[PDB]
Nucleic acid binder design. Sequence first.
RNA 1: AAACUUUCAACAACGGAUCUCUUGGUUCUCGCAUCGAUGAAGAACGCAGCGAAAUGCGAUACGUAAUGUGAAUUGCAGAAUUCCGUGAAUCAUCGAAUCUUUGAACGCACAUUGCGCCCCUUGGUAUUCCAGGGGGCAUGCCUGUUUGAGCGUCAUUU
Length: 187
Amino acid sequence: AYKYLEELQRKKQSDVLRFLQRVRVWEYRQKNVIHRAARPTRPDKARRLGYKAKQGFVIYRVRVRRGNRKRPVPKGATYGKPTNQGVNELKYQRSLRATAEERVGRRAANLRVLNSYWVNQDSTYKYFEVILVDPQHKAIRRDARYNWICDPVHKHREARGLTATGKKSRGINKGHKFNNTKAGRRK
RNA sequence: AAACUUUCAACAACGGAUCUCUUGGUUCUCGCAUCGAUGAAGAACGCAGCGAAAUGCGAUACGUAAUGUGAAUUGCAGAAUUCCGUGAAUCAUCGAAUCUUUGAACGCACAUUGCGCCCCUUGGUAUUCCAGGGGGCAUGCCUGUUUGAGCGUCAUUU
């Protein structure tokens, strides 16, 4: 079964994928910033990423906000070149869904987060859904086929960068790049 | 001629330089992995027979316990009354304790020591009012437990 689902949600828009994404988003949208877990929306390629299984269960949902970069201030200003001068249209190196992963963390790091999956997109957001495993918990480290997440440092890192999209938005390359730095370098 | 004034003598005198001093500092190198909701870092306020502070400590207050050292004095011998062959204030001690009022600060507050609610036990003696000692009531999430919610929705003998 898992396979059908996977390669099924692989065809977006498309009759079902759409007439579904619509009801859902029309739902989801309305339910508090982040609105922690229910029972795992799309379980398909969720396993690809250590699915639901953690810890016993726990996968929360969050609506990040869409768009570009809110350059604060009102001004400039600061000379401008090399703007500086520029404001309205800086673009966020962050990683839209990344932000999601972080806030989710905050909204409760009684757990630690294994990875985050997309789900839908308005013109006023981007509906991402994150996973967990409650290390400070049960089988999590007991039936620990996975105590990885449990050990000392590998935790809360749901935003020290060492996550996945950050790992990606940085340097998981190898060759043709200056992407393990740090470095800087070189003095 | 002195006074005065300059000048150089010696003696004092202002001053604290030079010399030598070093329980600091400064930079080196080599081991080592530890804070806190089991209440941390920080803050007050206090605690010696005699103490202001630096220091240590918390109403068991320059200290309790426990060890070995000790073997003999500490706050070492400031004074002082001081007390000792049953082990004195010192080191180590963190296989014990005490750890006020606080601070991530926590029942609500907090320019105040102000204001509530439970539970246990004492006086007034009818539980329901007033006073005494003991124990307690933050938040976000995790997981189970335990009650109830909708025209989410299933099935039942009506």
